[PDB]
């Protein structure tokens, strides 16, 4: 395609997919997918963006901390609680009351599952009011000490003991690759709470606080006819809200194990589908609409779900929260794990390697990541690993000091003996100052690794050096 200028980029982004070789072609198409540049993301958004200027195709891989990244979920609003002593002779809509020091805060809780003897098996306490009061008095999400829960005064039956913990802030789920896809959606620990708080397994598709803006609306074949009147409840916040299902769908839920799903971000009805919890079942087109499969195959850009522990006849409003992409602490290695996704010609045909994108990171990682990226093009020898200097070394100081630094770094010598870049590949193209662009998003002038740019400048000229596009200043010039 002029010799198939396929770039390759890996780094931290505001939005997943995490650890996936998702391909990108437009700017407005990468924003859609990994979108705005945060002050922790900048140099990677730019890296891509100002490449797609000379760019046909870009293959990226988002680096997430696997240990602390989180996909927004419906678990992450609820409130710890443990039925210390199941009562007896209780029933199902017996109301529960959460007090703050003998003072009523929430009074809309309610037992929701008993057995034959009235032994309390499951309850549901809305946290809208309490997290409010709790935030308001420093006890968030700690809680516990002055926070108490009693039953109606009273339900038919007696003896019970509910014990309150903290406000759960761990969404309890992270989706990365798809080999693990619903396998994380089906972890004892996760699936556990989906039972405990009687909700379905519906989570945001990509790690990130950006997922908190999603709001699923679920209606079953049951409350679908009453679709207008049916007053869907809101988990975990509380309160209700008139359904909308029949007022958005023509083709309504067919079988009793089919549900209407309406996904919203910012009041926008981002997606609208009908799915089934029973394998095989299809729409009027023999399209397998069994939940687990539908999503298993790029079914939805926004969310991801699993029929497992999906409450029968469940209808309500799910509120995703606790969503948490942490670039906060993506370790250098967490980057190298990512880059590795390209280290075999068997798998990915990628011609160029945007590497300078780490220019800004911890000087150490600035060097050791790239250094390693070179050792991927080296061992594969179907590419160009192009690489740029660390901001530290080139942007602040005057040229006098500037060059001294660069040359020391390229060997060992003075200050950068340790974090050197002392390698020598015929595939290694290093990258020689650092560019000063304007950031149409944050609306600020910003220094970015120049390598990202020249790489697109290659996909161009011949097959894979002529002024660069959007520069407005270079660290050194020229002369």
From Swiss-Prot:
A GO CC term assigned to this protein in UniProt: virus tail, sheath
Record localization: Virion
Keyword Heme: no
GO terms classed as biological process: symbiont genome ejection through host cell envelope, contractile tail mechanism
Main location: virion
Keywords, in A-Z order: Viral contractile tail ejection system, Viral genome ejection through host cell envelope, Viral penetration into host cytoplasm, Viral tail protein, Viral tail sheath protein, Virion, Virus entry into host cell
Family membership: Belongs to the myoviridae tail sheath protein family.
Role description: Structural component of the bacteriophage tail which consists of a contractile sheath, a tube and a baseplate. The central cylindrical segment of the tail consists of a rigid tube, composed of multiple copies of gp19, surrounded by the outer contractile sheath assembled from gp18 subunits. A total of 138 copies of gp18 arranged into 23 hexameric rings constitutes the sheath. During infection, contraction of the sheath drives the central tube through the host outer membrane, creating a channel for DNA ejection from the capsid into the host cell.
Assembly information from the UniProt record: Hexamer.
Name under which the protein is recorded: Tail sheath protein
Recorded name of the encoding gene: 18
């Amino acid at each position: 395609n002029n010799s198939t200028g396929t770039a390759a980029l890996a780094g931290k982004f505001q939005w997943g997919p995490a650890f996936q070789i998702k391909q990108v072609t437009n700017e407005v198409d990468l924003v859609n997918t990994f979108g705005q540049p945060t002050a922790e993301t900048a140099d990677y958004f730019m890296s891509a963006m100002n490449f797609l200027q000379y760019g046909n195709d870009l293959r990226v891989v988002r680096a997430v901390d696997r240990d602390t990244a989180k996909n927004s979920s419906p678990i992450a609003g609820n409130i710890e609680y443990t039925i210390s002593t199941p009562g007896s002779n209780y029933a199902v809509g017996d109301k529960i009351t959460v007090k703050y020091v003998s003072d009523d805060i929430e009074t809309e809780g309610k037992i929701t599952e008993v057995d034959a003897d009235g032994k309390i098996k499951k309850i549901n306490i809305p946290t809208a009011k309490i997290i409010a009061k709790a935030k308001e008095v420093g006890e968030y999400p700690t809680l516990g000490s002055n926070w108490t829960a009693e039953i109606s005064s009273s339900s038919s039956g007696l003896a019970a003991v509910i014990t309150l913990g903290k406000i759960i802030t761990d969404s309890g789920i992270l989706l990365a690759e798809i080999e693990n896809a619903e396998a994380a959606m089906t972890a004892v620990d996760f699936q556990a709470n989906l039972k405990k708080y009687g909700i379905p397994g519906v989570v945001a598709l990509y790690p990130g606080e950006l997922g908190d803006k999603i709001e699923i609306e679920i209606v079953s074949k049951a409350d679908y006819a009453k679709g207008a009147s049916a007053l869907l409840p809101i988990y975990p916040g509380g309160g209700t809200r008139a359904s909308t299902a029949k007022a958005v769908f023509g083709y309504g839920p067919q079988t009793d194990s089919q549900y209407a799903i309406i996904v919203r971000r910012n009041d926008a009805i981002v997606q609208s589908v009908v799915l089934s919890t029973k394998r095989g079942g299809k729409d009027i087109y023999d399209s397998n609409i069994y939940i687990d499969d539908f999503f298993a195959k790029g079914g939805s850009e926004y969310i991801f779900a699993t029929a497992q522990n999906w409450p029968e006849g469940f209808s309500g409003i799910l509120t995703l929260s606790g969503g948490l992409s942490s670039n906060a602490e993506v370790t250098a290695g967490d980057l190298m794990e990512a880059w590795d996704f390209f280290a075999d010609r068997e798998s990915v045909d990628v011609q160029l390697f945007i590497a300078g994108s780490c220019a800004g990171e911890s000087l150490e990682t600035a060097s050791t990541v790239q250094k390693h990226v070179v050792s991927i093009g080296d061992v594969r020898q179907d590419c160009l690993v192009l690489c740029s200097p660390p901001r530290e070394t080139v942007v602040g100081i005057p040229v006098t000091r500037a060059v001294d630094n660069l040359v020391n770094w390229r060997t060992a010598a003075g200050s950068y003996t340790d974090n050197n870049f002392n390698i020598s590949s015929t595939y290694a193209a290093i990258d020689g100052n650092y560019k000063y662009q304007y950031d149409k998003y944050n609306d600020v002038n910003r220094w970015v690794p120049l390598a990202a740019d020249i790489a697109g400048l290659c996909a161009r000229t011949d097959n894979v050096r002529g002024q660069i596009l959007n520069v407005i200043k270079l660290a050194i010039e020229t002369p």
